[PDB]
Every structure is written in C-alpha cells, then in structure tokens.
Design a protein around this ligand. Structure first.
Ligand SMILES: N[C@@H](CCC(=O)N[C@@H](CS)C(=O)NCC(=O)O)C(=O)O
Ligand SMILES: N[C@@H](CCC(=O)N[C@@H](CS)C(=O)NCC(=O)O)C(=O)O
Lengths: 220, 221
C-alpha cells in the first residue's frame, strides 16, 4: 500500500530496484508501463516523472526516479543497517563510483545506445564502436572484480544490483566469454544464488536477450 | 596539503570537483594529466585508477575516482554541514537523481560521445543523433529548473556543480537559446555569481568551447 514500483521486467534499471526491494523485504505494488506503447510519454506519467523514464518509485506520495537514486533511498530509509550501502566514506566512494559508472559507461553508452537504434528506429545493423563499447565494459568490470567477491568490496551492495542488472543483459548484444572473463562469470553465478535473484533479475535478463535475438541485429 | 586532484581544466567532471573543492575551501595539489598525450594510460595512473579517467582524487593515500563519487565524498567528510549534499532521504533522492542524470544522459551520451569522436579519433563530422541528445539535455534541464533557482531543490548542491560543469560546456556543440531556455540561462548566471566560479569552471568552459571551435567539426542534419 505504501510503495509502488513502475516499470517492466526487460529493463535493467527496473531490475536493479526489484532486487533491492526483495533484498530489504519491502512489500510493494508493481505497475507495468509499456515503453513500446510509449505509455511513459503520457502527461499522467510525466507528472510522476518529467524525465519519462522507468523505473519510478512512489513512496507515500513522493515520486523518486533513477534506479541508482531509488535504491540508495531505499537502503538509507529502510535497511536495518548500512550493509547494502555503507556510510563509511571510503567504502561509500567505491559504491558511488560503481553506480555512476553503471549509469554512464554501462547503461547510457552500452545498452541504451544500442536499444534506441534497434528497438526504436528499426535499425538493423549497428556500428562497431557499439560492439567495442561492450568489450570495454567487460574488461573494466573484469578488472573491478580483482581480489574480491563483490563489485565494490567484500560485501553485497546496491552496486552489485545495479551492475548485475545491466552487465548480465549485455549477453543480449555480446555473449560472455567466461574463459576470457572468469571473474564476471563467478560474480553473476554467486548473485544467482540469492533466493530472490531469479524473480528480480534472472527472468528479465533472458526476456531481454530474446527480445534482441529476434531483431536478428548485426554489428558493423 | 592532504588532497591531490588529477585532471585538466577543459574537462567538465574535473571542474565539478574544482567547484566543490573551492566551495569547501579545501587546499589541494592539482596534477595535470594530459589525455591528449594519453598519460592516463601510463602504469602510474592505471595503478591509481584502472578505469583511467580524470578526475581522480587522492586523500591520505586513498584513490577515489568519478567526479560524482568524489564530490559526495568531499562534502560528506569535510563540510561543516550537509548543505551541499543534504542527508534528508527525499532531498538526497533528488540530488542523486540529477547526478546520475549527469553521468549518463549528459556526460556519456551528450559529451563523451562527440569528444571521443572529434578529438581522439579525429572525426570531422558527427551524426544528427548527437545533436538531438543535446537538445533533449537542454529540454530536460529546463524542466528540472521549473519553479526553483537550483537544479535539485532550492539550495546550492553538488548537483549544481556537476550539471553546470557539463551543461555550460554544451555551448561547445550547440549554443544555448535563452528564448527557449531562459531557466538554464538564468541558472548559469546565478552560478556565475559565485566568487570561485570563474577559476573553478568559467575559464575551462571557455577553453573547451575554443578547442571545439578549432576542430571546425560539423553535425549531420
Ligand atoms: N540510468 C537510468 C535509465 C532509465 C532509462 O533510460 N530507462 C528506459 C528503459 S531501459 C526508459 O524508461 N526509456 C523510455 C524513455 O526514456 O522515454 C536509471 O538507472 O533509472
Ligand atoms: N562521468 C565520469 C567521466 C569520466 C571521463 O570519462 N573522463 C574523461 C575526461 S572528459 C577521461 O578521463 N578520458 C580519458 C580516458 O577515458 O581514457 C566522471 O564524472 O568522472
């Protein structure tokens, strides 16, 4: 009755929120918004989110948007501790960096870049820098995982949620050589062990990979 | 004395950090990293920041990168209050939204898309889509400024610093029509009133506009 989440399961940033919600044991209502139908462009949605993105969170009449902002909000307001978003400045700085990296280098530049050409402008072949963008994403994330079980240190954080949500979706554009990237493979698999992963993230990953596999789209 | 900032003045995210450092009246060493000469790819810097971006900040032997993580770190650790990065969760959620907006929508998609092409890979004309991303940026920020003086509520925050460093640099690509965009026009003017703005952001905004001028590069229609 308090929290309502807007979005759809193929969206990576929507799946970052689903995970965090599940992780905090917060009951919530889920309202679909059909992006394909352009439901986000309606002035009722606009009212909730001038930026017309998903996810949006409504809490008790307040609207919060941007998956990174939403999940930071959720932890800071509703967690029992700061385990998922530690308040120690150095630890926090690593988490914040990984979040901001997801927003820019991973999401806007790697996913949405491609998603707009294919899914919204029918475009059928894609420039090779779109390909190279992903490879560089894998390389960075492989490097970020050196010496540690989780993406921002030695404990699970919202940064794991944000980056797994999109990095796992990258399979849709370029499969993951797990022998070139054994740390990304282990990390994904360790998170797949979470009891809520399959519903929050797993199914929407596979859905997104199949939405793209159907476009038959090509690089270069 | 304590802090060192690696970067160069024409870079929008370096200037978000410069603005913050100045607003907190923090002293720091400023080390030039020449990305034209690819100095970020040296062993030295890679060890400091594996993503090899500017800015990087060094504090007490620790390396923080990403302008947004840096400026949040600085306020949270050095400010006399949270005015620049309020802790109230609702107020925090707006500032954090704007910041992530800056990282993805403005910087990665608006600026580095072009800059990488035009300056590093010497391309001389760039797609219509890069023009439209920038119109879309201006429209958004115009709406975000509705009914308030600052980008994230009605107090100066690190969201102002982050977005002004980038939004002011967009003049390099598309000049700002203040008949369409009076709120942005006015938000920039109000930030220009800060005694520290000229050194922290204003000059480097002009150097970047100039560097892009010199490329004579063109948008496709
Ligand atoms: N980085 C943002 C991205 C939001 C985003 O671009 N979402 C897409 C879905 S993949 C969307 O709503 N697109 C429709 C639109 O922008 O109008 C976040 O983390 O929330
Ligand atoms: N959104 C990031 C942007 C970082 C970034 O891409 N910086 C550029 C300078 S404009 C850079 O270091 N380029 C050199 C490289 O990536 O190798 C931030 O706020 O720190």
């Amino acid at each position: 009755v308090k929290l309502t989440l807007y979005g759809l399961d193929p969206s990576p940033p929507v799946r970052a929120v689903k995970l965090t919600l599940a992780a905090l044991n917060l009951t919530y209502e889920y309202v679909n918004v059909d992006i394909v139908a352009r439901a986000q462009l309606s002035p009722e949605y606009l009212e909730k989110n001038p930026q017309h993105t998903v996810p949006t969170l409504e809490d008790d009449g307040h609207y919060i948007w941007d998956s990174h902002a939403i999940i930071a909000y959720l932890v800071s307001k509703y967690a029992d501790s700061d385990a998922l978003y530690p308040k120690d400045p150095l630890k926090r700085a690593v988490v914040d960096q990984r979040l901001h990296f997801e927003s820019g280098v991973v999401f806007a530049n790697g996913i949405r870049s491609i998603s707009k050409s294919v899914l919204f402008q029918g475009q059928t072949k894609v420039p090779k820098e779109r390909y190279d963008a992903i490879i560089e994403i894998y390389d960075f994330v492989e490097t970020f995982l050196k010496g540690q079980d989780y993406i921002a240190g030695n404990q699970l954080t919202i940064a794991d949620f944000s980056l797994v949500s999109s990095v796992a979706s990258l399979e849709a554009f370029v499969a993951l050589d797990t022998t070139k990237y054994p740390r990304i493979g282990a990390w994904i698999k360790k998170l797949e062990q979470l009891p809520y992963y399959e519903e929050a993230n797993g199914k929407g990953v596979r859905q997104l990979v199949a939405i793209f596999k159907k476009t038959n789209f090509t690089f270069e």
